Structures are given as structure tokens and as C-alpha cells.
Scaffold this active site. Structure first.
Site, PDB file in Angstrom:
ATOM      1  N   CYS B 163       0.796  -1.264   0.000  1.00  0.00           N
ATOM      2  CA  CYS B 163       0.000   0.000   0.000  1.00  0.00           C
ATOM      3  C   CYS B 163       0.801   1.273   0.000  1.00  0.00           C
ATOM      4  O   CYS B 163       0.346   2.319  -0.508  1.00  0.00           O
ATOM      5  CB  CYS B 163      -1.004   0.068   1.179  1.00  0.00           C
ATOM      6  SG  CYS B 163      -1.989  -1.425   1.382  1.00  0.00           S
ATOM      7  N   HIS B 295      -3.892   7.342   6.495  1.00  0.00           N
ATOM      8  CA  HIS B 295      -3.935   6.216   5.587  1.00  0.00           C
ATOM      9  C   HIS B 295      -5.427   5.826   5.448  1.00  0.00           C
ATOM     10  O   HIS B 295      -5.904   5.570   4.343  1.00  0.00           O
ATOM     11  CB  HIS B 295      -3.093   5.093   6.171  1.00  0.00           C
ATOM     12  CG  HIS B 295      -3.028   3.878   5.302  1.00  0.00           C
ATOM     13  ND1 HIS B 295      -2.632   3.942   3.990  1.00  0.00           N
ATOM     14  CD2 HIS B 295      -3.285   2.574   5.561  1.00  0.00           C
ATOM     15  CE1 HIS B 295      -2.643   2.729   3.473  1.00  0.00           C
ATOM     16  NE2 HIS B 295      -3.042   1.883   4.404  1.00  0.00           N
ATOM     17  N   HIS B 333      -9.680   2.330  -2.087  1.00  0.00           N
ATOM     18  CA  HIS B 333      -8.257   2.132  -1.837  1.00  0.00           C
ATOM     19  C   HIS B 333      -7.465   1.616  -3.064  1.00  0.00           C
ATOM     20  O   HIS B 333      -7.583   0.484  -3.416  1.00  0.00           O
ATOM     21  CB  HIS B 333      -8.117   1.133  -0.680  1.00  0.00           C
ATOM     22  CG  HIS B 333      -6.707   0.994  -0.179  1.00  0.00           C
ATOM     23  ND1 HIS B 333      -6.347   0.090   0.801  1.00  0.00           N
ATOM     24  CD2 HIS B 333      -5.573   1.651  -0.516  1.00  0.00           C
ATOM     25  CE1 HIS B 333      -5.046   0.170   1.015  1.00  0.00           C
ATOM     26  NE2 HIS B 333      -4.550   1.099   0.217  1.00  0.00           N
TER      27      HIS B 333
END
Ligand SMILES: [Cl-]
Lengths: 852, 854
Positions: B163, B295, B333
């Protein structure tokens, strides 16, 4: 910035389970490229038959790494292997990985394939989520950071062929700039999917003969290979072993080329090489050897070698040596940089450049080969001295180059203590792992740096490495001892013995250890005012020296203190302490209640006050009956003095009645043996007259008594009275009361827990048998010195070895002068000596697991 | 001086339901949910997957020929790479930088990427797979192909930290710029969802929300929604930047290390240490932060770990609440590219002065005390940007953490200035006519934004082979719209034609005096003639119609204006390939060639006029005559001669006033065009000038003390070609200029040497020669006038000529004509990346869900 060294390395390469086999294959001219069907049918889809393959991909010591079997089966083999190769690279440097936990150590892994991830996600109905945790590219780096507890950067990178040397470069920059104190650099490649090879075949990159004919006219492509390599880099100060210092590491990219993205640019490679030696302040003439990317391609070889020629050979008077590891084992793609580095470092450590295979006719497009400016290493050549360069160029145009300065540290000059024996300890996942370390230690028994490094990596808990062993090196009576370590917590107990342990010459063998000698010299200073010198009493050749009470009390305590000091310097702290009679004075030192000078003076005054008085003749005798039986049978004036064990007690009293009782008892068939006490009835009312003057001397010696800890079980005060003011501290009164009261030894031994490790602190382990009888059977009893032993230094080291087998940590390095680091060049490799529990076979994808 | 200052200089991207960053912003500020539930990538609900995911609008478009990719290779390239190549080009020009200026530099490339699904689909069939699919799909190529095309020679690396990949790329590029290793860098983040099996993996790990939503910070948070993304950012050291979105104060990384909870359990304690260590080392106070982009994936465990770490790191001593948001709540995401997607949201918020709100925030996660006590405040409504530093977090599922601190650019708009009222020229280049039209339209819409126009002008100098369409628009003028055209192929030599008499007019040059460079040139010419009681600027201001009837006034003023025009052309870097002058026009030719200084040329024009005057010759005349030169010769009464050979069928005669006038009259009678010139009553380029020669030669010898050679670019019109290699034709001496005055003008003769496809500029206060030029030049020549007699605004007419010069494929940046815009551009200057259009007519292959194992 910071100086960066290569501190450790390990790897698995084609036909090579470790770096020692890799080296044997290299220097032996063995071709590591083979043509069997290990990964897929020979010639499938028209592929070349040859490729470099690892001997096994199924092995993994999953439990050491905390991986459950389900996750182990679904982990990329590259990662399973990299976890073990990483551990081996760290210990190879003589560093215990535990010491790097929680540090900002970084991880950079060069990797270009995720074939296992593809095989494992092929069936949506049956696939498992944890295959992502074991196969996703980032995990190749992240799973290392996780296991080793590294907190610096953790990155998987792909620049194709140059990946692993690019990892090395980024790691070097992070250490150089002070961002990381250390770093793990990895390179991995496996050949599971035949489709991938088809792709390269059709691009025209593969040799139909599956060979990297580096620098040769016949070069027509490369042979695909597998590889798993890891290197530990550290800033200079942290290194124990140093293979080489990285003088510079850099990268550039070809940029635009009219010929296409996959056409290598020699002009850009040349600029990289030049910019690096210019910025490191290194002269082109200082290079001895260059490891070329050397894949054996028709276009790449000339581009690269002509670039090297222009960068490095413009003003050189001597030819520049050049080699390529790919000619020996094929091209492991992203792992290529680190594989070439391993060949280089191994060549330097052995003083011989390993040569290339398959070099017969020089590529005619390369002038320096025809004219001698470049010289291919096609025969083993001695290493003469100078810097080394390594090139790694990716097929997309990413170039990396590094400059190394080899470590040329000579072996140490012969030193005094080198002749003293040494203790080597080892730990392992299996008995064979331990045996392997001890065997190699024995083979290099005079290599102090090697033994020191081995001793540093052995402190691994028994839960993680269940086998342990030791060997006393340089001695007379020794061989390896190996055993499985009994599970559980093992409390360490010190037993300080009393009278009867003195002998002529005691301690002289241990005087060769500086710490013991220094302790004895300190005790000498304590008694110097009284006309005594402990070291001189130990040197005495007079058999009657220790018949004098003051000589024997002082010398006994001094030796005990010296032994406690050797144990303390290895960081040992007892969980329990028990003293027998005068042994309680050394217990007070061991518990931290008495300073060295107070303990020695206490033993002096105890004897001197006896010498300065007159007592009636007394005796003591070991009687074969119980404590209770003794209190009922003892004649008037005679009393039980020492409760040593269930069936052995010592009586004390007037000389006549004692000798009588011994007679009577022997009459009735009871064991009775008079002890020799020099006409003294110790530990009885007889000593009462000594109390007053002794108490007066001790009050001046122990001015500020300290509290006895709960570790220290008194043998002079009954347990029922452990809370009394008298038992609280190691006071003048406590020490006086010890002399006139019975020794309740057996009573204390009963409180020693199960599985205890018990050391006898004495110049002669007199109590061994009493200890065995009075302790639970799960206890380990270790003697540290033996009367009249040929060499008590060896006997003592064997006991420290036994301590290690028991699961206790005690590094013998601390007993000897510190070895200077970095280790000399040529110190034996350690990574190939590491063995794992490889009994299980974990899943590895099969060629048929991929689309066809 | 820790190191070099690093700024974010340009950005571009393609995000869910957003073809560019302008659409991304519209969606963000409009509260549009970019996560959808259609079957674009696979049958929604397949294998029990969530139906919702963030998807790009299109994956099939790629301007293959611009990037030099043959069709066979374009069909076998990862769509991530095809998109990244265009997004990278857009990121560079967005910064107002022409990518050609970075070629051959040590610019680096770092790309955060985690999937290679196309590579898997394309290697599935061993019998049919092709080798070049490796070149278009292998992970390293996501970076290497960019370095290749853009000719970047710094590091070129593809990295995977899950990520956090794209923010890790940004951190690595920040370090390489900060330490002086790279002057600039391209940072990319890419993710596509082609293979449903991948989503199944995450589903089984328990990472996906069944509702396909990232309910960041909310009690209902139960996992994330997968999305796609292609983002690129240009970082450069401060000195290279034109636009600055923000300065990176610090960027860093750490890793969780060992965790009793498992490798995928996020550690708030380690994240917190990273955040603290970064503001401490940057010397930044925790109270200086306005906003933090978390995040924020909306997981039950991750959200509190992260927000409680942020609280401890940043909220210990804060008096005001700290704003927090998460772009994932708006678009899902996009995994490795999440750091750059969040960064785009931050920079777009700062540029617009509004924090774009989160979606799906209804009830605070109860395990996060600072959301309940107001120490942390979720942006769930658009809030104005008030000022302060910004932090951005990106944490990978394997434990790799990245954090960056930004200092927003708060540069205010420029102060109102005088020149800002002048019209401006905007030039544009493009792959298609629509691409050009788009830039000219936006330029028109922001016509008073100088920094914006200046940056657009800087990206237009692209060769016609790469951008075949060009356009221009003069903005802020009375009239005029866009001109767009395909650029005629081939090399086009630039020729300057300096005209002579008959071009003077009352008020000439006044409009151009508003340009500082022209004005400064005129003031310099004034100084040359000041000793002679003249001031060029005053002659131009004269309202007297007879001012230019005086030959000294007209000679000096014409030369001065031509010099001023040559100076405007030179400041844009234009160098002629050829030079032709007409009569007195040969003086300016000398200046243009390089053989006469400004003062010499002006003094040469002065003496030429003054010596004529001083002699008080008998009245003479000249007249534009609608006849050929030869046809003119035999009808030329005694005393009259052919003085100027202008074209095949037009000539200028010269002689005694009486006979020229009478000949003029008879010409009109016999139906011929006869037009008397204004020549101060003198017969130029005739025998009558011969008596002027001696005194003129004496004055000119003092003016031109050291003659210089005449380049081969300059074709003489006073000396016949047969003699061009003689000694007289060699230098621009006093003799050469005297000879020009006494000899005929062989103009048509010189025009014959002008090559095909030439671009010809008329250097004159009035383009008198346009028709003569058309007739005498090859038909493939482009003729451009720079000034027009009596025009309402010659500054606009001159700029439109500079525009026509651009259309012809010649490069001339009009920015150099005006005061330099100060950089960095003001905050809020419109984005450029969304204005870039490509040739997207073809549809290239994209793998289908069925191309993977099921
Ligand atoms: Cl000039």
C-alpha cells in the site's frame, strides 16, 4: 559519511547448497548448469534443455521462523529460502541476530518474479487468503523485517537483472548517510513457470545451448538460472568480519536509444564506471579485477567490454583482469549482482580468482581481448592486490556499478594466551548442526577470531535451538559434548563449600587467567598488613602450609572469591546461594553483602582468633546415622555439628568422648569416621570462647552490614528463625554465630527447586556426592575445580561447557583477552556451517500448475 | 544547508470516474462517490466478491505513435504503463516545463506498483505468446519505459511495499533530490483490477468490506474497497520549478518490525515514532499542522491504531483540533498508488482553498478518544484552508510505513501592473486540432492570468513531427480568435526582408513603444542622433503629416523602427537564414546580419539623408510604375531611368521632377498605374545621386571605421549577382552604402534565390512589399507582415504575426517580449494537466476477466 563494509554473506546457488559448495564448484571448474527435468520436461515448448537450478526448493525450518504449516505450504519458496539465507548471512558475520532486533536495520530485496503467487491464486473456489501473505512481492522484504525485528526501510525492488546490485546500492547509501546502522541485501530467482522462459526465448535472449559464453565469439544469449543470496552490510564500527569495504556504489539509466529499450548502451555504462571512480577518488590503475555483467550476448558483451576498456584501460600499463560468474552457473537474473559478488568475495578470501568456463575464442568485436588490455580469467590466478569493480546491467537499461576495497588484514602475531586452552560453545536446530560447528572449531582451534565469533552466535535460547554442545580446545582431555537441552526454566544455584577442600598448589592453574589472577592479587592486598600473601601460599611447595588455620581459611575464601569473579564476568547471577560453614563468607560476597576485602578479612580473623586462643582438644567424626538419631545417641559433651545429608552427619566435641563414641558406634556396626580438624571441634559450644574476641574484630571489619537477599539460604540459622534480626544481615554477629552453630546443610538443599543447575564453588568439589543425595534428582551438579587435577583451567572450562549444555548462557570469550576486530582475511566462513531441521517437504508449485 | 529544497512541481492522474485531476476534484468537492457497482471488469458479485470497486473510466486509450510504440507492441503493453506514459507527460507540462528540457539529464524515476496481471494474461499461451509482451508488462518496465521515452538517466526503479509503494517512491525521489543526486524526478503510482482472483485473496484474508466502502474513522468500518489509479508527480529542486504546489519539508520511512499480533497487524506505536521523528528532524512544531491525510482504509483494527498514534504524536500539546481526512472514503483504496492519490486530493484542496470532505462518516469509531473529545476533527463538510503544514501517511499491509510533511505554497496573486493591460500572445501545440483548441480556449478563459499564459507558452515548443497541430490567439486585444492548423512538413528557412521608402506613416511605431524592448531600442537610436538635434521618439509622436516628407526624418525613423523590430525578433532567439533589403532597407540588413552596430546603422541613415539635403540638388522625383522594367526602359523619356526592379511587372522610375511628373500623367492617360513616391523631392538610385557620393563617403568613413564582412545569408540588392563575390560586396563599408544610394535596386533578382518553403518576415513600419513578395517568391513561401499603416493597434498585429510564425513550425516564445513573470506561480494558477489531449481514436487490447484461470 559512514564507512560501509560487507560483513557477512550466504546463499544457495545452482548445484550449491551453500557458499562452500559454490566455491568448490567455482574453483573446481564444475559447470553448475544442468539438463535434467527438475522444473519441467527437457525441451518443453522447444526451450533450451540447460538451466541453473537449486538442488532443492522444498526445505524450510518453519517452526524456527514461527511459520505454521498451513502458511509454510503457501509461501513462495524464494521467501522460505531467503529467511534461512538471511539468518546465515548475519551469523556468518559473527553477529547474533538478536542484537539487531529493534534497530533501524534496513532490508532491500532484488526480485522480479512472483510465479508462486500466480499458481496459488489460480482457483477462486479453493484459494486461501494467506497465500497473499506468503507470496506478494513486498513480503519478500517485509517478512524478513518482521521475523528479524528490523525497523529500517523494507523494500522489494525490480530493475530486472540489476535488481540485487541496485538493492546493494540503496543499502550502501542508507548506511553511508547514517540512516541505517546495518542492512540486509537480498537477491532471489526461481524458475517455476515454463511460459516465462518461452517469453525470453521468443525475445531472442536465450542461448539455445543454455550457456553463457561470456566474452566468446560464440556467445548467443544467456542461460536462465536460480539463486537466493543475502549479504549483511554494516557501518565499519559494528563489523566483526569484513570481506571488503564498499568504496562507492552508483546507478544510472541508458535513457533513450535509437536501437530500442533492450539494446544495452556501452556509452552510458562507461560514464557510470568513470563517474564512480572519479567520485570515490580512486585511480583506474588501482583496479585489479572487474566482474562484468557478462551474459554472453552478441550485442551486450562488446557494448560492455568496450565501455570498460574506455573507462578503465586508457592509461593502464598492466592488463585488467575480467571474469563472469554467469559462465559458471548461468544468469540468475535479478539475483545476478549478488551471485557475482559472492564469487568475488570467495575468490578474495581464498587468494585465487575463480575462472570462467566456456571461453575459447575472443569476441572479435572487442579489441582489448585481442590486444591484452583486458585479460579473461580462464585459469585460477593468484589475487595480487587492488580494487575490484562489479557491473550489473538490467535489460530495461538500469545500470549499477560498485567499487570494492578487499580486506587484507593479516593473521595476528603469536600471543601468550593463545597457548592457553579455550572453550567453544555451540547451539543448533539439530545435533548435526551442533556437531558441524564443533568439528570446524576443532579444525581451526588456533584461530582466535573464528572461535570468538562462533562463541558470540551460540547464545540462542534452547526453545529456538534445542541442541547444544561444547569442546575445550588446546587441552589434553577433551572431545565434543552434544546434548538436547532439557526443556524448562533452570535456576542457577551457587554452593560455597567449607573446610576440607584445600590442597597444595590449589588455584595455580587458574592463575593463568588474568581475571582470576587479579582477584587473587586483590585478596593479597587485604592480608598484606598481617604478613600474608595469598598468591605466595598458593605457590608454597610445603605440604603443611594449609595445616595452619589462617592460611587455609584465607586461601579458601580467596579462591572462592576468584571463582565467583570468573562467573560474574560472564554475566552469571545466581538465583540461589548456599554456603557450608566458612563457605557462608563467600556466600556473602556472592550475594553482594560483603566486599572482597571484608570477606577476606572475615576469614582471616576467624582463623587468627582461633590461633590466639587455647581450646581443649576436640574432634569431629562423620557418623552414619540421622540428625534425629544423633541427638538421641550422642554421649554427654558430644553434639551434632553438620547435617550434611539424610544419612551422614558430623559430630563434634571433646576429643576422648568423640573417639569413644566412634568406637561404640563401630561396635554396633554403624559407619563412623573421624574427620581431621587439627584437634578442633568446629560448630559446637566448644567454639564459644572464640566468640567474644572474634565479634570484636569483625565489628571493625563489617562496619555497615547489608541485608541478605532471599536467594541466600542460611545454613547457620534454622529456617524457623529466618526473620530474626540476627539473620537479617551478614553482620559480625552473623559470622560469629556461623562458627559456633551447627551447619544445617541438608535443610537448605531441600529448598533447591526442581531442574536447578548447581555449581560447587570450591578449590576441590568435596560436596558433589552429598549434593547428589540431598538435591532433587532433576538437578544438574557441576564441579569447577578438582584436587590435584593436571589442569584445573581445562576442568573449569569443561564445567562452563556443561553450564551451556544445561541451557544457561555464559560466554567464555569474557574469560580471555578480547580479540581485535576486524577478523583477518581468510578467517573461515560460518554460513556454510549452519544446519536446519529440514525433515519436512513443503509445497512447491509444479509446471502443470500454470496455464498451457 | 542540510541539502537542496524539494518541491512538487506538477501532477496528473486518472482516478475512479475521473479522466483527469479536474474531474477528480469536481467529484471530490461535489461529494460524488467514485466507487461504483457495474460489470466493467467482471460480473459484479462473481465468487461472492463485493459488487463495489473504484474503476477508471477507460483502460484502452493510448497515443501509441507519440510514444513511438508500434501497434503490435501497444496491444501487448500493460494498460498501467500505457496510461502512466501519458500521465507522466501531463505531470511534466502541468509544471509549465517542456519535457525536452529534461532529456539527457540525471532525472530519476520511481514507480510504486504491486500487480502484473497483464503479464500473467499475456504469457498464458506458450504456443501463441509473443516475446514483446515482456517488454510491455514486466514490472521493471513500468519505470524503465518512462526513462527510455523521456530520456532520463537518473535511477529508474519499480518498487513494491504494498500500500505504501507510491509514497515510498516519493520518499526515495525526495532523498535523491535533497542530497543533490538528481535535479528532478518522476514519481508514479499505478493499480488496475483485472483479475478477480486477486480480490478473492483479499476477501479471504478478511480485508475487504462486504459493502465495498472505506468507512474511514466510522464505527461501521469493516474493511476496504479496492480501486484503480494512475498518478504521476514531478518533483524538482526549487530552482527548476515554475509551479510549486508545495514544498516537501521531510519524507521518511520505517517498518513495524516484529509484532505479537502478526505481520498484517498495523502498529500505531511504530507509526507514531515515524511521525514524531520526522517533524523533530525537520524542525517543525506539531502545532504548525493544519491537516493530516490519514492512511484511513476504514478497518476495525487499523483506524484506531493509526488515529491513536496520530493523537500521541501530534495532539499532546495542541490547543486547536487537528483536521483529518481520508481520500479512500471518496474513491476507495487504490493500493500501491494510494499515497499519490491522497497527495492529489491534498494538493487540489490547497489549490482551491477548500478541504474536500470525506464521505461515509456518520458515527465516530468508539475506540478513538480524540474523535470523541474533538482533539481530532474529521473533515465531513467542505472547510476553508486556513494555513499550516500538512502531513500524509501511507502504511503498507506488510508493515512498511511512509510519512511526508508538506509546506503549502501560499504565493499571492501578482500586484496590478501597467504592462498587464497589454495584449498577450498565446501559442499552443497538440497531437490533434482539439488538443490545440482546448489550450487556446482555456487561455482565453484565463486571459488575465499571466503566470498561466506564460507556462502554456513554455510548453508549446514541440517539434511538428511530435505535435502536428499548432495554434495561436492574441488575448486582451480588440479583435481576433484562435487560428489552428496542421503544420506543413519539412525544414523552413527564416528570411528577413527589410523594406525601404514609402513605408513611413504618421504615428508609426507608437503602439509598439508600449513594449519595453522596442521602446528601449528606440531610446537608444534617439541617443545616436541627439547631437544632430533629432529625437526618433519625438518624430514618432509628431502629429504633423509632413514630418516624414523631410528625408532625414524618414530615413532615421525607418531605420530605427526596423532595428527595433529586429531587436524584438532577436530577443525570442530568432536568427535569420537569409536577408534581403530594399534600398535604405540595406542599412537595417547590416544590423540584422551583424555587421553594423545600432549606432552605426542609425548614423548611416542620418548621413545619407543629411548629405543629400546639404547639396540642394535640383528637384527630382520617383514614381511607382505599373510596368515591367524592360517595358519601362523603352518608354522612359530622356533623363528618366529604371531605379528599382521590384517584380516582373512593376518598377520604380527615377529622374528630373518635370519629366517624371509628365511621364506619370501620360501613364495615367494611357491607362497605366503611375504612383509618385514621397522622396523629399529627390531622385534616388539614379545619376542625380552621383554628386552626393563624395561627401557621403567622407561622412560614412567616420561612422563605419572598421567594416565587417557580409554573411552569405545576406543577398545584396545594390550589387548584381555576377559581382557578389567582388571586394565591394564583401563588407558593409562606407563604400557599400554609398554605392547602394547611387545604384538601382535589384530586388526581384535577389528574391529568386529564396528557397522553397521559406518563412518570410517583412521588417518595416508598413508591409508595403507584401504583393511584390508574393509575386517574386516561390509559391511555397509564407509571407508575414509585422506592422500595418494606420492599424488600430500594431502591437496586436505584430503579435498575430509572431503567432503565424509559430503556425509555420518556427519557434518564437512571446514570453520574452514582456516582463518576466515571477516564479513560483501564485497558488491557484489553473491546472494544465487536464488540458492535455491526445490522439485517442484507437482502442487497444485490455485483458478480460476470462483471460485468467477460474
Ligand atoms: Cl542583431
Amino acid at each position: 559519511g559512514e564507512e560501509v563494509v560487507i560483513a557477512g554473506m550466504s546463499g544457495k546457488l545452482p548445484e550449491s547448497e551453500n557458499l562452500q559448495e559454490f566455491w568448490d564448484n567455482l574453483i573446481g571448474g564444475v559447470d553448475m548448469v544442468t539438463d535434467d527435468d527438475r522444473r519441467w520436461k527437457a525441451g518443453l515448448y522447444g526451450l533450451p534443455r540447460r538451466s541453473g537450478k537449486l538442488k532443492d526448493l522444498s526445505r524450510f525450518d518453519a517452526s524456527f521462523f514461527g511459520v505454521h504449516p498451513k502458511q509454510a505450504h503457501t509461501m513462495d519458496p524464494q521467501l522460505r529460502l531467503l529467511l534461512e539465507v538471511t539468518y546465515e548471512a548475519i551469523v556468518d558475520g559473527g553477529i547474533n541476530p538478536d542484537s539487531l532486533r529493534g534497530t533501524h536495520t534496513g532490508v532491500w530485496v532484488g526480485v522480479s518474479g512472483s510465479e508462486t503467487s500466480e499458481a496459488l491464486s489460480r482457483d477462486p473456489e479453493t484459494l486461501v487468503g494467506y497465500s497473499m501473505v506468503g507470496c506478494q512481492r513486498a513480503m519478500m522484504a517485509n517478512r524478513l523485517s518482521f521475523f528479524f525485528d528490523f525497523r529500517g526501510p523494507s523494500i522489494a525492488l525490480d530493475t530486472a537483472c540489476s535488481s540485487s546490485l541496485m538493492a546493494l546500492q540503496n543499502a550502501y547509501q542508507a548506511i553511508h548517510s547514517g540512516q541505517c546502522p546495518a542492512a540486509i541485501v537480498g537477491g532471489i530467482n526461481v524458475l517455476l513457470k515454463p511460459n516465462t522462459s518461452v517469453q525470453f526465448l521468443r525475445l531472442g535472449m536465450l542461448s539455445p545451448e543454455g550457456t553463457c559464453k561470456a566474452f566468446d565469439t560464440a556467445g548467443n544469449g544467456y542461460c536462465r538460472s536460480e539463486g537466493v543470496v543475502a549479504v549483511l552490510l554494516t557501518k565499519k564500527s559494528l563489523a566483526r568480519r569484513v570481506y571488503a569495504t564498499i568504496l562507492n556504489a552508483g546507478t544510472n539509466t541508458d535513457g533513450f536509444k535509437e536501437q530500442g529499450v533492450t539494446f544495452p548502451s556501452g556509452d552510458i555504462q562507461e560514464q557510470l564506471i568513470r563517474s564512480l571512480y572519479q567520485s570515490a577518488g580512486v585511480a583506474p590503475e588501482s583496479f585489479e579485477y572487474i566482474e562484468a555483467h557478462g551474459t554472453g550476448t552478441k550485442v551486450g558483451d562488446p557494448q560492455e567490454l568496450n565501455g570498460i576498456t574506455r573507462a578503465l584501460c586508457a592509461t593502464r600499463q598492466e592488463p585488467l583482469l575480467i571474469g563472469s560468474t554467469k559462465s559458471n552457473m548461468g544468469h540468475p537474473e535479478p539475483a545476478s549482482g549478488l551471485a557475482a559478488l559472492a564469487k568475488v568475495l570467495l575468490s578474495l578470501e581464498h587468494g585465487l580468482w575463480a575462472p570462467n568456463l566456456h571461453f575459447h575464442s575472443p569476441n572479435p568485436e572487442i579489441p582489448a581481448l585481442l590486444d591484452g588490455r583486458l585479460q579473461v580469467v580462464d585459469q585460477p590466478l593468484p589475487v595480487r592486490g587492488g580494487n575490484v569493480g562489479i557491473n550489473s546491467f538490467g535489460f530495461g537499461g538500469s545500470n549499477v556499478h560498485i567499487i570494492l576495497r578487499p580486506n587484507t588484514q593479516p593473521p595476528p602475531a603469536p600471543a601468550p594466551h593463545a597457548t592457553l586452552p579455550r572453550l567453544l560453545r555451540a547451539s543448533g536446530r539439530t545435533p548435526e548442526a551442533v556437531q558441524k560447528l564443533l568439528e570446524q572449531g576443532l579444525r581451526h582451534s588456533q584461530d582466535l577470531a573464528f572461535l570468538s565469533m562462533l562463541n558470540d552466535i551460540a547464545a540462542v535460547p534452547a526453545t529456538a535451538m534445542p541442541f547444544r554442545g561444547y569442546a575445550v580446545l588446546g587441552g589434553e582431555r577433551g572431545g565434543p559434548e552434544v546434548q538436547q537441552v532439557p526443556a524448562g526454566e533452570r535456576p542457577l544455584w551457587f554452593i560455597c563449600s567449607g573446610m576440607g577442600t584445600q590442597w597444595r598448589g590449589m588455584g595455580l592453574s587458574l592463575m593463568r587467567l588474568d581475571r582470576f589472577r587479579d582477584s587473587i592479587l586483590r585478596s593479597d592486598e587485604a592480608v598484606k598488613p598481617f604478613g600474608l600473601k595469598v598468591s605466595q601460599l598458593l605457590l608454597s611447595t610445603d605440604e603443611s602450609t594449609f595445616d595452619d588455620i589462617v592460611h587455609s581459611f584465607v586461601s579458601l575464601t580467596a579462591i572462592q572469591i576468584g571463582l565467583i569473579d570468573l562467573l560474574s564476568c560472564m554475566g552469571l547471577r545466581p538465583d540461589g546461594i548456599v554456603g557450608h560453614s566458612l563457605g557462608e563468607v563467600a556466600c556473602g560476597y556472592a550475594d553482594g553483602c560483603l566486599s572482597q576485602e571484608e570477606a577476606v578479612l572475615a576469614a582471616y580473623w576467624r582463623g587468627q582468633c582461633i590461633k590466639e586462643a587455647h581450646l581443649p582438644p576436640g574432634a569431629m567424626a562423620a557418623v552414619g546415622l540421622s540428625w534425629e538419631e544423633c541427638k538421641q545417641r550422642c554421649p554427654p559433651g558430644v553434639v551434632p555439628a553438620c547435617h550434611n545429608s539424610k544419612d551422614t552427619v558430623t559430630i563434634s566435641g571433646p576429643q576422648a568422648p568423640v573417639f569413644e563414641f566412634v568406637e561404640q558406634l563401630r561396635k554396633e556396626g554403624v559407619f563412623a569416621k573421624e574427620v581431621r580438624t587439627g584437634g578442633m571441634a568446629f560448630h559446637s559450644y566448644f567454639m564459644e570462647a572464640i566468640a567474644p574476641p572474634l565479634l570484636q574484630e569483625l565489628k571493625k571489619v563489617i562496619r555497615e552490614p547489608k541485608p541478605r537477599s532471599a536467594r541466600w539460604l542460611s545454613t547457620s540459622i534454622p529456617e524457623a528463625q529466618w526473620h530474626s534480626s540476627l539473620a537479617r544481615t551478614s553482620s559480625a554477629e552473623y559470622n560469629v554465630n556461623n562458627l559456633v552453630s551447627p551447619v544445617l546443610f541438608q535443610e537448605a538443599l531441600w529448598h533447591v527447586p526442581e531442574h536447578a543447575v548447581v555449581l560447587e564453588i570450591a578449590p576441590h568439589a568435596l560436596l558433589q556426592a552429598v549434593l547428589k543425595r540431598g538435591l532433587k534428582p532433576s538437578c544438574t551438579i557441576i564441579p569447577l575445580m578438582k584436587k590435584d587435577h593436571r589442569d584445573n583451567l581445562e576442568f573449569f572450562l569443561a564445567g562452563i561447557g556443561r553450564l551451556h549444555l544445561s541451557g544457561i548462557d555464559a560466554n567464555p570469550n569474557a574469560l580471555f583477552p578480547p580479540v581485535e576486530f576486524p577478523a583477518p582475511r581468510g578467517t573461515p566462513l560460518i554460513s556454510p556451517l549452519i544446519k536446519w531441521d529440514h525433515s519436512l517437504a513443503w509445497d512447491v508449485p509444479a509446471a502443470e500448475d500454470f496455464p498451457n
